[PDB]
Structure formats: C-alpha cells, structure tokens
Paper text:
Although most chaperones are standalone proteins, isobutyryl-CoA mutase fused (IcmF) has a G-protein domain covalently attached to its target mutase. IcmF catalyzes the 1,2-rearrangement of isobutyryl-CoA to n-butyryl-CoA, as well as pivalyl-CoA and isovaleryl-CoA, using AdoCbl. Here, we show that the G-protein domain in a fused system forms a similar active conformation, requiring IcmF oligomerization. Cryo-EM structural analysis reveals that the second protomer of the G-protein intermolecular dimer props open the mutase active site using residues of switch III as a wedge, allowing for AdoCbl insertion or damaged Cbl removal.
Substituting the switch III residue Q341 with alanine lowers the catalytic efficiency 2.6-fold mainly through a decrease in kcat. To further investigate the structures of IcmF’s supramolecular complexes, we prepared cryogenic EM grids and collected datasets of C. metallidurans wt IcmF with GMPPCP and butyryl-CoA (wt IcmF + GMPPCP) and Q341A IcmF with GTP (Q341A IcmF + GTP). For the Q341A IcmF + GTP dataset, we performed 3D single particle reconstructions, using repeated classifications for both 2D and 3D steps to separate out heterogeneity. Local B factor postprocessing was also performed to yield a 4.6-Å resolution reconstruction. For the Q341A IcmF + GTP reconstruction, there is clear density for the guanosine and at least two phosphates of GTP in all the nucleotide-binding sites. Although the resolution of the cryo-EM IcmF structures is too low for a detailed analysis of protein:G-nucleotide interactions, we do find that the switch III residues including K344 (K188 in MeaB) and Q341 (Q185 in MeaB) of one IcmF protomer are in direct contact with the G-nucleotide bound to another IcmF protomer. Overlaying previously determined closed and open conformations of IcmF onto the structure of Q341A IcmF + GTP reveals that the G-protein interdimer interface clashes with the closed conformation. Specifically, the switch III region (residues 333–344) and a helix (purple in Fig. 7B, residues 363–380) of one protomer clash with two helices of the substrate-binding domain of the other protomer (helix 1, residues 942–965, and helix 2, residues 974–995 in Fig. 7B); these clashes are not observed when the mutase is in an open conformation. Thus, in addition to switch III residues residing at the interface created by the G-protein domains, they also participate in propping open the mutase.
Author numbering:
A (entry chain C): 220 to 378
B (entry chain C): 61 to 139
C (entry chain C): 458 to 1093
D (entry chain A): 776 to 1014
E (entry chain A): 458 to 616
Write the structure that this text describes.
C-alpha cells in the first residue's frame, strides 16, 4: 500500500510552505471483500490534514472482483478536474504484482514499495519498475536500508 | 477514530455525503453534543442522514425519548 | 547476574579465608608447623577483592558503632548526633536498628553485600540514614473551576500555617489544551472536575499574593500534555510576582542588568513540581494530543535549558505507573514496565549531550501496592535493581545513585460494593508500605482528586496513617532483616522474574518498537481479562463480593456528585479571553513565525515558548504546534 | 489457665506472661505432689490470654511456646504429645476506648494480624461486652469478616514462618525471655506463689503499674491516637 | 539458662568440627598431609553431643523433606499427603515453608536448637506440623434470662 502517510507529509509541506494557497482534491480507492460483499474504507482515520474548506477528500471502493477500480475511474478523475481545483491526488488500493491500470489515465504516478520485501533480486521480476516517477520506501527502523537503496538505484539505472 | 471534532465530523460527513452517523458516547453529558449535531445538520439540509446513539444506561428513558423525538431515530440500550 | 556471580564467588573466597585462619589458629595448639597453609591463606587473600575487603574489615567498627545510645558522625564542619534507643511501657529497651549476631564470615560478607544497614550502599533497605521525625508534610489538594474561587479556597485552608504545600488539578480542557470558544460542546463540560485556565494572566491571578519565593512552600500540579507550555507560564509568573514586588518597593522600571540578576536569583530559588509523564498516557488511553517522540524531545530540550541555567532544586519528571495498575496490571509486570520506562528516559537524556550527574537525583517514581504478596517486598526490588545499575554501568554520584519513590493506595481493590470493608482492608495496604521505609505516603479515597466533595472520611483517611506511624509499637523498628524468611526468598524470586521480563521486552524489538506495536496494551488487556474472569468465577476468592453477602441486601443509598459552575463564570472567562486576544493582534503573528522557524531549524522550542507565553494564547500555541505537525495521529 | 482479666485490669505484657505461666506451673506442681503421674493430664491444660498494643505482644506467644517446652523435657520427661502447649488469643478491649469507638474497629486489625502471624491455635474477634450485656447486632459481621479477610484471601497469610528477614523478632524474644525469668526469680524469692497470693505482692505490682499507665495517659507524653489530640472541633455527640 | 549455655558450647563445637573437616579437605590439595588434624577431628566428634549429632546428620534429609510440591509421612498404619505450593496471580510460585540457606554448621545448629519448623521439637515456631485448613469452628455464645428462653435461642441458632 503506502497511502496517507506520505500523503500526510506532502500535504503538511504544501500547507506550511505555500501558506495554504493551493486547493487539493484527493480521492482514495479501496478494495472490496469478495465474500461478505462489504468493505472497510479506513484510510481517513489517517492524517487530519484535510481540515480546510479549500481542500476536499473523498473515499471510494473497488466495487469489482476483477480490477481494483470502479467502472468510472477516469470519468470521476475528469469530474474532479473540472472543478478548477489546484491538484488531483488519487490513491490506488492494492492488487498483487501485475497491476499498472492507473498509469494510462494519469500524468504523474508516485510509486512506493514496502521495505519488508527482502527478495535480494526479485525486484527484477517485479513488474512496476520503469513505469513511475520516483521510488519510495518507508520504515527505516530496520537494517539493510543502505543495501536496499543501492540495489534499487542500480536497477533504476539499468532500466 | 475517536476524540474527533464535532465540526470536523459534520464537515467530513458532508464531504462524503454519508447515510448515517454512529456515535458511542458513554462519557455522559451527551445532550449538548447531540443537540449541536442536530442543529448543525439541519443548518445545511442534510436531514437524509440518520442518527443513532449508544451511551449505556446514562440516559434515563424520558431524556433519551425526548432527544429521540427531537429527531434522532434511536439510542441503543445495553440491557 | 554478574553482580550476583561476584557475590557468590567472593563469598566462597571469604569462607576459605576464615576457614584457613581458624584452621591455623587451632593447629598452633598442636605444635607441628606446616607453613604451606599460611602460604595458601596469603594467596587466598591476594585473590580477594579490595573494596569488599575494606567492607569486611569494617565489621567490628559497625558493631561498636550501634552499641551505644546515640549515634555520632562528624562530617564537613558539622557533627550530627541522634538518639537510637526507645523505651517501652514495661521498661524493655528497644534499639531502632538491630545488628547481626552471626560470626561466620561468609554470611557476614553476603549480607553486607545484599542487605546493608539503611543509609548505606547499596541502599537496599532505604535511602535516608534513619527515619525522619513526625509532622508529616502532607500536601492538601483543592482545585476546581475559576481562579478566584480556587484562590479563595487556598487562602481558606492554608491560613495560619507555615509549611504550605498546595496541589493543583486542572480541568480536562486544559489537559487537552484546546482553546475554549462559543461552541457549547466544549463550553458544556468545561470547568467541572478541575480548574480551567487559558492565558498567563489567569494563571497569575490564580496564584495571586502567594509568596512563590518562600523556601518552605511547595506547589505540585498534575498535567502532562501541555506540560511544556504551562511550565513557561509558571516560570513567567515566578518572575512576575517578585518583579512587581520591587515595583512596589522601588517605584521605577528596574535596569536590564538588575532585571537579569533578579531572574537568575529567582530561578535559582523558585520551587515546584509538575507530575508530567508521556509513556503512561500513550499506553493507557491513546488520548495524547502529540506524538510521543515529539513530546519526549521537547522534554529533553526543556531539561537542557534547565541544566544550562543550572537550577538544582526543582524537577518536573514523574515516572508514575498508577494508571497501569488501575487498569488491573499484574504487580511484577507493573514494576518491570515502570523500571524499563525510567531507564528509557535515562538513556534518552544521555542521548542529548548532557552528563549523567546533573539529573539522576531529580527523578522519581509513583506506583501502587495491591493485595498480592509481591507488594510486601516490591519496594525492596525497586531499590535494588536501580541501585546496581547506577554503580558500575554509569558510575554516577552516590547521591545520584539513591532512588526515591511514591506509594499510593490502589482504588481498584477498593470497590464501591461494600465500601465499609475497603477502609478496613486499606490498613493492610498501609502496613507493608510503612514497613518498606515509605518515603511519602498517601491515603486517598477512590477518586484521586475527590471527584465528589468528600466528607469526614478524610479524617479517617488521615487517621489510619497517624495510627501506625506515631503509636504502633512494632513500627518503631525499621529493619526486618533477619527473622522473616519470605522477605529474602521472594526478593530473589521477584528479582529473577523481573530480569526475565526485561529480557522479553528487549527481545520484542526496543521500547519504542513495543510502543508502536502495542505489545504492552495487549498484555495488560489479556491479564486484566484473566483477572476479571477469575473474579466472576471465584477460582481466586475475594472477600465481601462473591460471598458473605448481607441477607438484607445492599440498597446502597447515595448520590452521584455536586460539582457545578455558573454560566456567568463561563461568560466572564470567555470575554476575558476575548479581551486578551483583541489586545495584541499584531504581536502573536511574529511569535508564531519565530516558533515555526525554531521548530524547523532544530532549536530550543522552550526558549521561544518562554517569550511567546507572555503574548500568545494557549489555544493558539496548540494550533501552531498542530500546524508544525505535532498532532497525535490514530496509529492503532 | 486464663489471665485475660489480668491484662484487662491493665497489666504490663511481660508481667502478664509471667503471672500466667506462674499460675500454670503452680497448678502443675500441685497436681504432681498428689502422687499422680505426669502423662495423664499435661496435654489437657489450656491457656487464655490477650494481646495488646505494645510490640512485645507481636512475639509474646513465641515465648510462651519456648519457656514451657524446655521445662517439660529435662525436668520430668513426659511424652512429647504432653509437652506441646496450646494457647488462646483474644483481642484486647482495653486498647479500644469508648470515645471515638469508630477508630477501634480500624485499630483492632493490627492486633489480629500479629496474632495470626504467630500461628495461633485459635482467634476470637469480640466486641466490648464479652457477654454482650447489650445484645450485639450487625457489627459482628464486621468483627467476623476481618478475620475471614486475613485468613482466606490475603496472600502473605500463606506464610507461617518469619525466621530469616526480621531481626527484631529474635532480639525481642531473647530480651523478653530474660525479663520473664527475672520476674520468676523475684516471685520465687517472694516465698512461694501461695505466699504471694497471701501477702498480695501481685496486687500491689499491678496497681502500681496501672497507675503509672494512667498517669502517662492523661499526661500526653506517651501519645494515644484519637484521644490526647486530633479531637473533632465539631464536638463528640457520639450517640 | 543452662540450656542456652549448652547451646553456645555445642555451637562452637560444631564450628570446630566443620572447621577441621574443611581444613583437611583444603590440605589434601597441597600435597602435604600431617594427620594430627584428623585426630583433633576425632576428639571433637567424641566430645560432640549425640542427639544433636543425629539431628545435624538429619539436615540433608530435611532439605529433601521440602524440595518438592507436597509432602507425605508414614505413621501408625497409614500415611498422609499434603501439598505445600501456592500460585499467585503473577504466577510467582511460593513455598509454604522456607528453610535457611546457611552452609556453616554453627548457625544451622543454633537454628535447629532454637527455632525449628512448626510441628517439631521444641515447637518454638508452632505446635501443629502444618497449618490447619479453613472452616474454623466459630462458636456461638448466647445466654440471658430463664432456662426456657435460652433453650429456645439455642434451638433457633443451630438449625
Ligand atoms: N513503524 C512505522 N510504521 C509505519 C510507518 N509508516 C506507516 N506505518 C504504519 O504501517 C502501517 C502499514 O501501512 P501500509 O498498508 O503498508 O500502507 P498505508 O496503509 O498506506 O500506510 C500503516 O497503517 C501505518 O500506520 C513508519 O514510518 N514506521
């Protein structure tokens, strides 16, 4: 995953540096439990940094067993665009390792990969390598961070 | 989550345009809180949302019934 | 474990030493001289340690020291003398301290290494050399609502008394530090169950006319969240009064130089205490408004400023554990967690470039005794585990090595059902606390701060303590040392258990790691659920609840509480905030920007607070801290 | 073999123990001189004495165990079952004062605990009137429950042997033993226990010590909680 | 007084005995062996008391007598078993009775001569072997007035 947290820090940096001169519209997308049919859209339990009328937040579910998104994802993205707001920030739920569905409908895609992955050279077989803007890893409370950073940089150089 | 601002709660609900509001207030003194919630809701035409409360046995039946008549659908008793 | 291993090894060494000595003493009566025994004895003595050898040689002097009636010790320029003998009703003469009758050296060395006389290393059986005399320094606590009525009550109760010790309990709004406003939600519960304050003005008016410079006076306020901010307020008031004093005596603006001299003097001389803590609240309710690390760093910076400005008498650190047991924690778990928290604070302070010898003696601890047998020895362990850690691991001052504690009764054991029995069984709690060389004893009701206005019960609450310390016969002794096995046995067992729990905590990935993972909350929940299960099942019986009920039933006629506040008081406080706000609209912005700059640039936030508090709102301060990101998030 | 009323009059602890044991030994010798063998009656003698506020009571029973036992082994060689000595302990109502009687319930707990720690053969928790001249009431529940509180739930009660971890026990034991033996020597020099009963030596000793105690009491040099100070300014209606 | 004097004398004697024992034990490691010490040990043992010597020899048996959880004793025609371990809410296991941890025989002898475990010579610490279990015989004292009234009260109480 990786939502919210980095979004939290980004939002705080934006507000603190530009004195809240930008209107951010953020939409999150969450998966749906296939068995009971329900869902748990628990991502606004995170940062309270939406407390400003100029900034809007909205949560949505996948609604689908096949994809991670609803049938109107690009349409709702354009609908968010049409409000003459400063910026659109969209979360992208979670699938396994073969999903890149958000790219064809987004200009910038900030990607994040979990520190707990080990996989000394399995990032190579991981699909989403040369399809993003900037690498992101959190939770440096564990060791081997320098090694993982170096290997990621080398793979990015190769790709 | 818990200990969330009333103004924040209502504003977020208008942001998400939700169907119901669930609150567990076992701390007491819920009368002013719920009255403020109801007034703020009726301030901006969001009456479609439903209100249900739970606070244990703090509310006597007459008091909770009066608040219910003010517009909240129910308050769920423990017993 | 290494300390104990050395103990065992040197004990065997001493046994060998006295063995060989008495051996040759007997042998010389035989005439035949085999000198190799003397060589072995010399070798054994050389292999022995030195400091322990001095301690062992001190023994006859120890015996001759306490043989007489009055103890004398001439130190520095003074000489302290004190009587050590008391008289019973039947003419039997009782020593306040009793010394071992042993003669075999090994036991002597072991006991001197594990359980010395009090007032000596390693302070197992109490820090002070002897028990202080009577006239307990029992603070009287009273605080609720506005500053005027609280000051009225303070004057009411403190009248005609020299040794003044006040305790302050603020309201919840202050603890959460949210700025009150027109909203009835915050306006409603305000002012009840505490004293609500908003600005430096109201804080000063609360403590109007009371000589904060009186050396024999103490003020202790209980709050942890805004602990930095209000602290500056207190400090500023500590200035303000005294400066105004000379304003009355001199009638002119003091010079900057003499102003600085006055500030330095009053800071050196002012006294107080704020029962502030971070770990317990985060572990207990998650009702923190700030990040744990954020608050800890702020506290460290404040300690840095205090050490830099060199105040040697006031402390604001309170490593308490009351709420942990209040939920129902197990005794050993409680002790281990408190010790871990304290040592974590010690390491954090070490990390900020401050030497150890400047803060160790200002730490404290606050925890409760229950009905389990472990409490009867708990304090013992509390002294021991700390003591050794200060000697070899860091080697702080002996005065720094000593540990002081606070003991309060546990209200969870005193259940409202059959309240009468609780008062009687509280005496059982008090007895062991007294036996363990209590440094400070509270006998409080269920509510920590008299949530309801109490009654004659406080008399009873006080009386029992007096009954023990002033008139109970056995209490004239202080040292259960030889003649009660369970003390030593349970001591060893509890020490081992606590060390093993320390090992577990270390293995679970760091103290802050456990904080992130909620290990402690889950452990406490599990054990509390087990406790309540046994309670409702009765596998562990409990008197007066599941059995021996009254056939007449328990009507329990009572009333809830009487603590109100007039709406006019709230309106007046609101417009007071309004006026103070409208006074300085241009000024607060500059201080807010400076606070931004300082927090961004890794500097002394408390320094900026010390100036902002004169001109900035508490609620504005909280919102600025939010803006910098200090808000506590929902990380369950 | 009771001495409860001896303490009730206000006797000193050591004197109480000494007089009680003197009475017991006198009965023993009186039976012995009648040509009756020892092993037929010794395990049947019983004792009845109370524990007061002074620290000696906290060890008092211990002495009663020791002094008897040795005397029964070398001097007569009775059976071991005969040699063992049984005793009774009851709360001391003298310490409880009618004034502020609410405090007496609290202060009885210390008396109870020291008796329990001494491995009593029995315990009685009794109100002021031993016969309840005024018929007692609800309060007895309390007087019972505390005993229950101590014996069924309090964990440390599972201890029965405090003997390495408190010096005062052993030291006071030796001191009390020596004092009691000295009092025995004085009694013997007084010309037999029967002679003492004739000339009233013990009455005079008890009277003198009781007067001493009352003098100290009304003086206030020796404090007594709840009476000589800390009086309620609201008066004491105490219905 | 004579009993205490005997205590002192035999205590110092036991000190002497263990002294000579450990002395010869240490001497055996140096190579030289002058046997006068063993003669002194024999003389002291002869001077040593008899019943007390048996009691001291009982000491390892005493240690084993309380090692486990329960204890059983054979007497007359039967045998009796009773448990001695208690468990706290903390899981801290508590022995009902604790024994001294001394090793030098002098203190051990004084302890065995002054204060044993309850239920042994000289019953210093308590006559009964082990604490009698709960359900104490709480008597009911009552009587006032005529015989008929007392009989009615007695019938009333013991139903
Ligand atoms: N220890 C630690 N935990 C973190 C950090 N950042 C986030 N977390 C927590 O780890 C959890 C795992 O989140 P994840 O599903 O991987 O992505 P996210 O839900 O968008 O944050 C989150 O819910 C955070 O509460 C960090 O820097 N350190």
């Amino acid at each position: 995953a990786g939502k919210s947290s980095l979004t939290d820090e980004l939002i705080r940096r934006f507000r603190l540096d530009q004195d809240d001169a930008l209107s951010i519209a953020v939409i999150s997308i969450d998966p749906s439990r296939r068995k009971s049919g329900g869902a748990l859209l628990g991502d606004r339990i995170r940062m309270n940094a939406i407390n400003h009328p100029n900034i809007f937040m909205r949560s949505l579910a996948t609604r689908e067993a096949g994809s991670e998104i609803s049938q109107a994802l690009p349409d709702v993205i354009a609908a968010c665009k049409a409000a003459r707001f400063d910026l659109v920030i969209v979360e992208t739920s979670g699938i396994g390792q073969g999903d890149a569905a958000i790219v064809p409908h987004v200009d910038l895609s900030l990607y994040v990969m979990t520190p707990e992955f080990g996989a000394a050279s399995a990032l190579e077989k991981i699909d989403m390598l040369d399809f993003a803007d900037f690498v992101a890893i959190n939770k440096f409370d564990r060791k081997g961070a320098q090694d993982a950073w170096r290997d990621v940089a080398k793979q990015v150089q190769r790709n | 989550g818990h200990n969330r601002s009333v103004q924040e709660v209502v504003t977020a609900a208008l942001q998400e345009d939700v169907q119901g509001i669930a609150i567990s207030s076992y701390q007491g003194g819920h009368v002013e809180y719920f009255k403020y919630m109801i007034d703020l809701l009726r301030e901006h035409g969001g009456e479609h949302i439903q209100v249900f409360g739970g606070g244990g046995g703090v509310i006597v039946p007459d008091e909770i019934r009066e608040l219910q008549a003010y517009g909240v659908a129910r308050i769920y008793s423990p017993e | 474990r290494a300390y104990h291993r050395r103990v065992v090894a040197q004990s065997k060494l001493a046994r060998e030493r006295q063995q060989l000595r008495a051996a040759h003493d007997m042998l010389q009566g035989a005439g035949h001289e085999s000198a190799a025994l003397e060589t072995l004895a010399s070798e054994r003595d050389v292999s022995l340690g030195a400091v322990e050898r001095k301690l062992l040689a001190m023994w006859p002097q120890m015996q001759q020291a306490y043989s007489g009636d009055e103890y004398v010790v001439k130190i520095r320029d003074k000489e302290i003398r004190t009587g050590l003998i008391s008289t019973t009703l039947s003419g039997t003469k009782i020593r306040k301290v009793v010394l071992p009758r042993f003669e075999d050296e090994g036991e002597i060395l072991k006991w001197l290494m594990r359980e010395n006389v009090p007032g000596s290393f390693p302070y197992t059986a109490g820090v002070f050399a002897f028990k202080r005399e009577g006239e307990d320094p029992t603070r009287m606590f009273a605080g609720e609502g506005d500053a005027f009525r609280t000051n009225r009550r303070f004057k009411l109760v403190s009248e005609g008394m020299e040794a003044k010790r006040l305790s302050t309990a603020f309201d919840s709004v202050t603890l959460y530090g949210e700025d009150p406003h027109e909203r009835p939600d915050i306006y409603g519960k305000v002012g009840n169950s505490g004293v609500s304050i908003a600005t430096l003005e109201d804080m000063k008016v609360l403590y109007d006319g009371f000589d904060l410079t009186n050396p024999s006076t103490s003020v202790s306020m209980t709050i942890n969240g805004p602990a930095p901010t209000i602290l500056a307020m207190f400090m500023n008031t500590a200035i303000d009064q005294q400066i105004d004093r000379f304003r009355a005596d001199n009638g002119r603006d003091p010079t900057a130089d003499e102003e600085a001299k006055i500030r330095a003097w009053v800071l050196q001389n002012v006294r107080g205490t704020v029962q502030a803590d971070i770990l317990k609240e985060d572990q207990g309710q998650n009702t923190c408004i700030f990040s744990t690390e954020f608050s800890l760093k702020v506290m460290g910076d404040i300690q840095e400023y205090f050490v830099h400005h060199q105040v040697r008498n006031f402390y604001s650190v309170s490593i308490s554990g009351y709420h942990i047991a209040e939920a129902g924690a197990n005794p050993i778990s409680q002790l281990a967690f408190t010790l871990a928290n304290g040592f974590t604070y010690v390491e954090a302070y070490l990390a900020r470039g401050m030497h150890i010898d400047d803060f160790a003696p200002n730490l404290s601890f606050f925890f409760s005794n229950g009905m389990d047998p472990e409490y009867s020895v708990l304090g013992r362990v509390a002294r021991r585990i700390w003591a050794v850690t200060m000697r070899d691991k860091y080697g702080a001052n002996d005065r720094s090595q000593k540990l002081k504690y606070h003991i309060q009764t546990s209200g969870r054991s005193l259940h409202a059902q059959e309240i009468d029995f609780n008062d009687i069984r509280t005496t059982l709690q008090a007895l062991i606390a007294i036996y363990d060389n209590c440094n400070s004893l509270h006998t409080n009701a269920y509510d920590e701060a008299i949530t309801t206005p109490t009654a004659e019960s406080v008399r009873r609450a006080l009386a029992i303590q007096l009954i023990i310390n002033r008139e109970w016969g056995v209490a004239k002794c202080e040292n259960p040392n030889q003649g009660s096995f369970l003390i030593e046995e349970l001591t060893d067992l509890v020490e081992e258990a606590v060390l093993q729990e320390f090992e577990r905590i270390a293995e679970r990935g760091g103290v802050l790691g456990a904080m992130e993972t909620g290990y402690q909350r889950g452990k406490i929940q599990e054990e509390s659920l087990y406790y309540e299960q046994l309670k409702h099942d009765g596998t562990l019986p409990i008197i007066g609840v599941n059995t021996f009920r009254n056939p007449n039933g328990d009507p329990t006629p009572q009333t809830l509480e009487l603590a109100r506040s007039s709406e006019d008081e709230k309106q007046s406080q609101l417009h007071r905030l309004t006026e103070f706000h409208g006074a300085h609209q241009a000024d607060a912005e500059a201080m807010l920007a400076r606070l931004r700059q300082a927090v961004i640039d890794n500097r002394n936030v408390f320094a900026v607070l010390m100036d902002a508090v004169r001109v900035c709102s508490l609620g504005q301060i909280t919102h600025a801290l939010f803006e910098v990101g200090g808000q506590y998030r929902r990380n369950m």
